[PDB]
């Protein structure tokens, strides 16, 4: 979904975006990615030394991604999670 597509995220993903500050029920994919970055940043999930690595184990984000960690340069787990967690409007 790329063409400024409008989406409603499933409950578990929506809870995460609202923690990141989203006061919203409808998003574009771009807006979802914005709030995902916000979340990782504010919960400081990225590795301190190697900041492309995100440690999401023992966080609700890990529950959705289904991995303990991921690289932002290997973002497949993220896009897969979004395929499962976004309803197209």
């Amino acid at each position: 979904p790329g063409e400024g597509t409008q989406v409603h995220p499933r409950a578990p993903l929506l809870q995460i975006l609202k923690v990141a500050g989203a006061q919203e029920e409808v998003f574009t994919v771009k807006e979802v990615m914005h709030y995902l970055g916000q979340y990782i940043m504010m919960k400081q999930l990225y590795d301190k030394q190697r900041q492309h690595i995100v440690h999401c184990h023992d966080d609700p984000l890990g529950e959705l991604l289904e991995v303990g960690s991921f690289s932002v340069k290997n973002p497949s787990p993220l896009y897969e999670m979004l395929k499962r967690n976004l309803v197209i409007l």
């Binding site: 970055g37 940043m41 990225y46 900041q51 492309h52 932002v72 340069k73």
Partner: peptide
């Protein structure tokens, strides 16, 4: 280098 720099460069 910074997570925020890296995140911005997501395809």
């Amino acid at each position: 280098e910074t997570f925020s720099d890296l995140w911005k460069l997501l395809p």
